[PDB]
Amino acid sequence: MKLEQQIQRVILEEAKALIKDYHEYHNRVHLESVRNKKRLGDSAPDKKIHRPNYWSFDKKFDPFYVKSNYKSIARSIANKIENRTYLPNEPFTKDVPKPDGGIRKVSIYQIPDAAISKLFFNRLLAKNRHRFSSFSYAYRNDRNVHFAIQDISVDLKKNERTFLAEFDFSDFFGSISHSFLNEQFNENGFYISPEEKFIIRSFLRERKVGIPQGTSISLFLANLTCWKLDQDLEREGVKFSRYADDTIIWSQEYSKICNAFNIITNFSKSAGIKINPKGISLLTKKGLPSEITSKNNLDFLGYTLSVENVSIKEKSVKKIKKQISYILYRNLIQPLKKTSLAGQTIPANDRDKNFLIAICEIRRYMYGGLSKSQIKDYLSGRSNRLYFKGIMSFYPLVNDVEQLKQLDGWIVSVIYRALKLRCQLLSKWGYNRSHNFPFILDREDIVDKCSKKTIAGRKLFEIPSFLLIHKALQKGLQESGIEKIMNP
Amino acid sequence: MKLEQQIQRVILEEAKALIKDYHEYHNRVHLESVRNKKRLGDSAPDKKIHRPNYWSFDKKFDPFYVKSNYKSIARSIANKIENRTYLPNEPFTKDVPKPDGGIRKVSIYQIPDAAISKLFFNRLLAKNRHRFSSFSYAYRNDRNVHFAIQDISVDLKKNERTFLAEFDFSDFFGSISHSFLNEQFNENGFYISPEEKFIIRSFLRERKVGIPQGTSISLFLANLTCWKLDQDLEREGVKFSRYADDTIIWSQEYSKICNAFNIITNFSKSAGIKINPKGISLLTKKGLPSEITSKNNLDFLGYTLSVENVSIKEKSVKKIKKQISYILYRNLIQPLKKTSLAGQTIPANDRDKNFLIAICEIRRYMYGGLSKSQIKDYLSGRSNRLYFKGIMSFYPLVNDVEQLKQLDGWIVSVIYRALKLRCQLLSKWGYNRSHNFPFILDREDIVDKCSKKTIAGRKLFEIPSFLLIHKALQKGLQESGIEKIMNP
Amino acid sequence: DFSDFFGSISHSFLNEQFNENGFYISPEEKFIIRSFLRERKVGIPQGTSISLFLANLTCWKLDQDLEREGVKFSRYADDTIIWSQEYSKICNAFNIITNFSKSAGIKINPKGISLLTKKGLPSEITSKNNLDFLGYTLSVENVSIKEKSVKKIKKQISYILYR
Amino acid sequence: DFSDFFGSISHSFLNEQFNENGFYISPEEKFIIRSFLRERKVGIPQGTSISLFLANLTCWKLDQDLEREGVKFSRYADDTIIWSQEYSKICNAFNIITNFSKSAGIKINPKGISLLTKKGLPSEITSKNNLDFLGYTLSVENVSIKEKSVKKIKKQISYILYR
RNA sequence: AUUCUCUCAUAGGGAUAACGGUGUGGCCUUCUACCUGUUAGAAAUAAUGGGUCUUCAGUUGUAAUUCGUUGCAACUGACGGGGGGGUGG
């Protein structure tokens, strides 16, 4: 297996995956444009298939071109690596505003450069796994971050009083002395071959200071850079997790967390660059007081972790409510707020197709399309497997029944109100439909009536419930684990 | 995928693997008996193909019978699991003397029971992997134990004064209250499904107290029982590794190791069973003194780890010397110490076939059959891969060049002395061959002369050297890692 | 060994402790204390009715400091034994005793420091698997009669039979 | 022994310390420091006018760390002695010196660790009741002249009389 | 041309219209409780078209119990938010 063959393999697969993604993109756009024509009648806009803009910045960003000449590309890349002249091209970088007011520098390397990054740095991470800390992650969407969440959650329950602290490492990785990185190359039992060292130095040379974040090489260089910070924090007895440019350190002792602060400051000085807290607090059982500034809830990604429960963060609940509310608005209100209703089917005969489309869209967003019969079959023993998709697949560690119960109520209420406004708008247009099925149900009757309705023998009006799929998720976590549900 | 199909798959594969092993066993015995007939002439004994004795204790121990009726076996096992009546049969146990004077209770479960143990406890270990400690191992032959060795080695170098302590957990696992195990089932975030809990309780019910050691279910129940000991030791800041019934805890502070002693005592009291040290010492750079009782070498499996180097334990070196010496004795002396030399080819014409056989056997034991040309091709860049087999594949972390150099000298000296005694015995029988090639070389000439000789165009006389394959091991650990070289 | 402490303890230190640690000493009891101390010149009379009170009154701060360090201890006559599960604690207790000695103007000397472990198990520091507490030998496994005491018992029985 | 530290200390480390710890080094003083270091290649010239400044500038962080640990210390030429009343402190000082050694890219080796106690009283760890500080033997009880110094004095007096 | 093929190949040449995907339905097959017409049929079932629950906690009875707990009834306790304006207890 020569290096050129490996490079050809990886580049071809990367380009092929991007081509598959684009094909599915435009196919989805066509299907959605058909449905939107049916929805908004003549007012429905026209399709506009785009192509990722960065594809035109350079031709090696474009997957189609890279597939066209991946053999020559890999031939030259292999020669450049063997002659120690390879230097990755400039990533198409795009700084994006962050909620704190900072900038997250998104970096997209060209397909050959990204393929090389994967090929080499995945090997490096695999061969140096046991030298790294447990909860070190590169992307905040990394699925395995949930394991760190589990850890903290468990402690926050077992330890009814936990001192936590949060840190931002954004400037550390934006500007870390490459000399410090190069020093760490031969420490901590790391196994980096001379060619892998050359590739590391090449990607660092294309940069000037700092590690490219949100990239294939991010995790390795971050772990290689922070290995002494992790060792010092582990000797202090503090537990910690780094995800992207964030770090959370927790302990049952205040002295430990303060010493961790000192450790981080010393490591910052050794790095020639500063790490600043977002800073330090105590999480305690609700009701119980605290000495130091305290908070009874911690926002870990899309989770609010408390000593009592794991819940969905308020921003995430707002996002979920936004999606459901927009589904109902787009299917049941927006079409009827257009200038003309030409080509828009009007509910009649006790059938509102728009309501079926909206309920099914909400079911996909929540359940992934599962029927309540399927979920109960899984929860009873009838079925030995249930596919876990939708929003709740991203919140597998939630155990707050009250939050899900409140969201159930909110779904029913919003369905009632959107249907009511739809009836009002329809009557304004000239269609009186208050007596029909979709618009006659009281809010306390929607769930039952919809549960009973059946089209094609399948109950496609049942109002999706978060609590049912939460029960299913708990059973699937006790049967498969986080990794299995998170990705089947 | 029903449970019966899973059981059938796993049982069929276990029985098939055992059948393949037996087939290769008797085939190897026949090949070896052919070569032994050629070696020892008429005096050579006759082949005696055995069958593992436990195969007759029960019919489900025998792989052939299990393959005969694995469908019925799995059918009944599945019904027993679903009706919650399954109980593993009695393992064929054989308690064996241990070097400390204790007994290591070997347990072989019948093929169906061992298949169930793998099927379920491998799933449990995979799904709870992030809940366990880093360096927890079930068998002392576990390849991954080398990662723990690496860690300690690295620390013993970086920390030039490290306090260590060793413990024996044999009696813990021999008699651990099953109530304690059952209590741990719903702690530390463990995901154990109800059926997995039933299987755990069933394997524990077949036993009465203790966890079966050296089995598929050993690691899960050991980690599940020792999860709190690991958590307390991790908060103390001590680093530790458990392998089979042994535990090593190291730190850079004395107070930490003493607090770990206290932690282990408290966990023993909570368990109702005691853990006893083998006990506590300080490793320091050689030459530097120590305050407490100190040792400048630590025996970790087949390794002697010191602040300066990782070397092969003295017992492992004695075993290596035993094997090489017996190769030379069996091939060059034993045949000639027999009553008659009927059918034993006598060295003549400057060719000793027995010497080629011995050199090749030593090369297989040491290199795996590699030629020094192959190893140098790998060490130069000509070859991108070298298969790492033989004895040194079990000591990949060795970095003591003096030890390997001394073993090289010993190999050459033993080759000379055995050849000399072979010449003496041959002349006793009536064959004067001191002038012939095998018996004329001085000790300081064996390596060169043998390197020059070539049979079939391949240098099959070159005296195997530990230092060459050690250089190759270092390159292959900087290129692939421990896992790749240990298993390809 | 606290023998020299009680043989020569500044009576000023004792008189200072009179109104500390919540002690209730009436004026007449203070007069009697001072009278028995005046019949003496320095030190507390040992093996007497007044020994325990004045010793406890003098060592009240040493006891409080040792109790905050987490060490357990017992004083009997002119002897003190301090035990712990931590080495740092016992060394800190040594420092506490030295500081209290300086505050008293008189020194306390060990008989000194060791570790008691289960028999067979080794030790880092100088270790002993048996501690002589009065007529007892106390070990991690058993409580036995000290060897001197067993000799005394054998002496009595043997002399009974001889006589 | 700091001998090899000063024989080979990275001049980059020295130059990094120039603007830390509140040091006031003028640009011309920096030029003279760099010039003397350039005449050398690695290490500080020992037994010279520039020795103390560069040694103190190089060891300022080791001194701060040891001072935070509560250990007391003295560096004289290529020698360092660190004393404390706690064992944990001296071990942590060992760790500090090793870390500072790594940061400097040069190793510092002990001559190593012991306990000085009043004569007669025992010790747990390897102990010595005398410490050789230059021409002095310092003990818990007295400061005396080292045996080599007494031999040298006797040599001189004896040779006066002989001559 | 995003297909196919050549150049000591992160770029350039050619030759052909194909290549790469998407929704629906079909078969294959993975797992899926019960009651039912009406089609086949001799009660063995299959495709079909309608319907019901299926989870968790405690109490009590019962059987096992290596003293962690486990199977079965069978009774109730939850199992679809919040807010604004009036209004009754």
Side-chain angles (χ1 to χ4, degrees), chain B residues 184-233:
Chain B
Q184 322 312 330
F185 280 25
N186 271 328
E187 293 265 347
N188 197 61
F190 289 132
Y191 295 121
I192 309 172
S193 76
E195 149 150 347
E196 285 169 344
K197 287 191 175 197
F198 157 70
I199 300 303
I200 292 159
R201 291 193 227 251
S202 75
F203 277 84
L204 288 164
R205 257 185 39 262
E206 166 55 26
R207 298 225 29 181
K208 299 296 157 289
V209 68
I211 320 148
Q213 300 303 278
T215 82
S216 306
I217 76 198
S218 296
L219 192 64
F220 181 73
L221 305 172
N223 292 351
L224 172 57
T225 303
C226 300
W227 83 267
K228 230 209 178 289
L229 172 49
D230 311 354
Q231 226 198 18
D232 298 64
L233 289 169

Side-chain angles (χ1 to χ4, degrees), chain A residues 316-457:
Chain A
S316 288
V317 185
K318 282 231 204 73
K319 170 63 55 33
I320 287 166
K321 284 187 177 184
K322 176 64 196 309
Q323 179 58 33
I324 298 168
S325 60
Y326 175 82
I327 288 163
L328 297 161
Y329 179 62
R330 102 161 308 191
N331 293 146
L332 312 164
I333 293 160
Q334 227 179 33
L336 293 187
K337 260 166 82 103
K338 282 286 154 243
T339 289
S340 172
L341 300 184
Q344 326 183 22
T345 294
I346 265 61
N349 315 339
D350 319 56
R351 66 192 27 266
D352 178 15
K353 285 63 62 198
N354 284 7
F355 189 68
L356 193 72
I357 295 153
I359 289 297
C360 287
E361 252 293 352
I362 296 168
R363 191 175 294 114
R364 214 169 47 91
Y365 179 66
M366 287 180 60
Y367 286 32
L370 288 175
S371 58
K372 290 181 157 150
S373 42
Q374 267 150 43
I375 298 173
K376 295 207 253 283
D377 294 331
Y378 178 89
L379 289 160
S380 61
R382 194 165 304 171
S383 178
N384 45 352
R385 19 150 303 192
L386 187 72
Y387 72 76
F388 285 99
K389 302 206 73 23
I391 189 67
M392 282 273 305
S393 72
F394 301 91
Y395 304 93
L397 308 165
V398 175
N399 63 63
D400 184 1
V401 179
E402 304 313 302
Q403 208 190 21
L404 306 173
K405 201 166 325 157
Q406 295 161 6
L407 275 167
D408 288 321
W410 174 97
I411 293 159
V412 187
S413 297
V414 169
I415 286 163
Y416 177 58
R417 289 172 198 153
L419 282 166
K420 155 174 316 313
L421 183 62
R422 173 172 179 80
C423 192
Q424 296 170 11
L425 297 161
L426 284 164
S427 62
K428 270 145 168 18
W429 293 105
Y431 328 127
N432 233 302
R433 303 290 188 282
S434 179
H435 54 289
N436 280 358
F437 143 69
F439 319 96
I440 194 60
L441 278 40
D442 214 51
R443 186 222 172 276
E444 288 44 29
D445 275 346
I446 292 172
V447 175
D448 306 52
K449 261 60 214 313
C450 290
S451 65
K452 283 331 152 85
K453 281 191 82 23
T454 43
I455 64 190

Side-chain angles (χ1 to χ4, degrees), chain D residues 95-115:
Chain D
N95 306 332
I96 292 167
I97 277 78
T98 301
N99 304 331
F100 168 76
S101 306
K102 209 26 170 70
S103 297
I106 192 55
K107 81 304 214 192
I108 326 186
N109 44 40
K111 298 293 183 181
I113 169 149
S114 78
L115 174 63

Side-chain angles (χ1 to χ4, degrees), chain A residues 187 269, chain D residues 20 102:
Chain A
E187 294 265 354
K269 179 55 168 58
Chain D
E20 293 265 9
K102 209 26 170 70

Side-chain angles (χ1 to χ4, degrees), chain B residues 254 258-259 262 276-277 279-280 292-293, chain C residues 85-88 115 121-125:
Chain B
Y254 184 77
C258 289
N259 298 327
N262 307 332
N276 39 323
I280 170 149
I292 73 160
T293 302
Chain C
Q85 258 195 132
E86 288 199 36
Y87 184 77
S88 56
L115 159 85
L121 315 185
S123 293
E124 323 87 27
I125 73 160

